[PDB]
Amino acid sequence: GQERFNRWFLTGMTVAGVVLLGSLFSRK
């Protein structure tokens, strides 16, 4: 069937993931 995805959700999730990863890398 047809499927729809929320691009904003993906972007927000990606941004949040990037922030968490950046913090993790920053903490080292």
Swiss-Prot record:
Expression across tissues: Bcl-X(S) is expressed at high levels in cells that undergo a high rate of turnover, such as developing lymphocytes. In contrast, Bcl-X(L) is found in tissues containing long-lived postmitotic cells, such as adult brain.
Source organism superkingdom: Eukaryota
Transmembrane segments: 5-21
PTM description: Proteolytically cleaved by caspases during apoptosis. The cleaved protein, lacking the BH4 motif, has pro-apoptotic activity.
Family: Belongs to the Bcl-2 family.
Self-association state and partner proteins as the record states: Homodimer. Interacts with BCL2L11. Interacts with BAD. Interacts with PGAM5. Interacts with HEBP2. Interacts with p53/TP53 and BBC3; interaction with BBC3 disrupts the interaction with p53/TP53. Interacts with ATP5F1A and ATP5F1B; the interactions mediate the association of isoform Bcl-X(L) with the mitochondrial membrane ATP synthase F(1)F(0) ATP synthase. Interacts with VDAC1. Interacts with BCL2L11 (via BH3). Interacts with RNF183. Interacts with GIMAP3/IAN4 and GIMAP5/IAN5.
Domains as described in the record: The BH4 motif is required for anti-apoptotic activity. The BH1 and BH2 motifs are required for both heterodimerization with other Bcl-2 family members and for repression of cell death.
Task of the protein: Potent inhibitor of cell death. Inhibits activation of caspases. Appears to regulate cell death by blocking the voltage-dependent anion channel (VDAC) by binding to it and preventing the release of the caspase activator, CYC1, from the mitochondrial membrane. Also acts as a regulator of G2 checkpoint and progression to cytokinesis during mitosis.
Name assigned to this protein: Bcl-2-like protein 1
Lineage: Eukaryota, Metazoa, Chordata, Craniata, Vertebrata
